[PDB]
Design a protein around this ligand. Structure first.
Ligand SMILES: *[C@@H]1O[C@H](CO)[C@@H](O[C@@H]2O[C@H](CO)[C@@H](O[C@@H]3O[C@H](CO)[C@@H](O)[C@H](O)[C@@H]3O)[C@H](O)[C@H]2NC(C)=O)[C@H](O)[C@H]1NC(C)=O
Ligand SMILES: *[C@@H]1O[C@H](CO)[C@@H](O[C@@H]2O[C@H](CO)[C@@H](O)[C@H](O)[C@H]2NC(C)=O)[C@H](O)[C@H]1NC(C)=O
Ligand code: NAG
Lengths: 50, 94, 49
């Protein structure tokens, strides 16, 4: 899922060139092939990600 | 060389990026809004119940000289109506 | 103004992003127009029925 509520398949196809994985969730970073999306988004140790 | 800055903001101390979003029905149609850190500079995240008062500071060329006590008016640029001020006219006095 | 009792609020229904301009209003404070721009991101969440 992207922050535009639009559902993107193949999380790596989302252009995410980086992925930091936490203890209780999986998240993807530097998501290039995403469209503008990303209205408010969020995160802490890092900024913005899908 | 004298300006004002709202307390607790840094022009480029923090880094993030460019964004785009759409806001509808809270305006004064669907107009796209682009946020860039270059001009707006920093984004402050306020919780569900938090209120904020942007106390402003007067800066001379080399440093801040005093806290502005004058009346100031606040309004978001794009044009909305959802924001409101908690105090009323009577509580302030009129 | 400072020492005033009023703080701007935002609806609690959803999280929103706003970019605010602020302008000093006192006519006899300074000669040219003092102005600043900042931004506020809110965080209202709507509970499941
Ligand atoms: C609008 O909301 C703000 C809250 O963000 C109100 O400011 C707060 O006002 C209350 C009282 O109305 C303050 O509580 C008490 O104030 C006395 C003042 O001497 C202090 O001694 C107490 O320890 C206690 O703090 C509160 O301090 C104040 N907020 C802050 C950050 O100082 C404001 O009053 C609201 N508007 C109206 C019209 O009430
Ligand atoms: C991918 O994400 C990383 C962090 O998640 C970004 O990190 C920067 O990488 C460049 C390499 O060219 C470094 O020079 C910067 O110092 C890094 N930034 C920080 C804060 O350490 C990276 O920018 C992202 N990729 C792109 C293309 O933006
Ligand atoms: C008003 C305020 O807190 N300003 C801070 C400053 O003190 C700090 O040195 C800088 C770091 O780059 O970030 C900003």
């Amino acid at each position: 899922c992207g922050r535009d509520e639009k559902e993107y398949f193949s999380p790596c196809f989302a252009g995410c060139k980086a992925t930091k994985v936490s203890q209780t969730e999986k998240t993807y970073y530097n998501c290039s092939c995403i469209k503008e999306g990303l209205a408010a988004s969020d995160d802490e140790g890092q900024f913005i990600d899908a | 060389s004298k300006y004002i800055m709202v307390r607790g903001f840094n022009k480029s101390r923090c880094q993030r990026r460019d964004f785009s979003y759409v806001i509808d029905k809270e305006l004064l149609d669907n107009l796209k809004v682009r946020y860039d850190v270059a001009k707006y500079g920093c984004p402050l995240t306020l919780e569900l119940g938090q209120m904020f008062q942007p106390i402003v500071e007067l800066y001379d060329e080399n440093g801040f000289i005093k806290i502005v006590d004058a009346n100031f008016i606040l309004w978001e640029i794009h044009g909305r109506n959802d924001y409101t001020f908690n105090s009323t006219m009577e509580q302030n006095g009129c | 103004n400072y020492s005033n009792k009023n703080h701007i609020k935002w609806p609690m229904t959803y999280a929103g992003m706003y970019v605010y301009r602020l302008k000093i209003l006192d006519p006899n404070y300074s000669f040219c127009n003092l102005t600043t721009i900042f931004a506020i991101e809110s965080l209202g969440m709507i509970p499941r029925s």
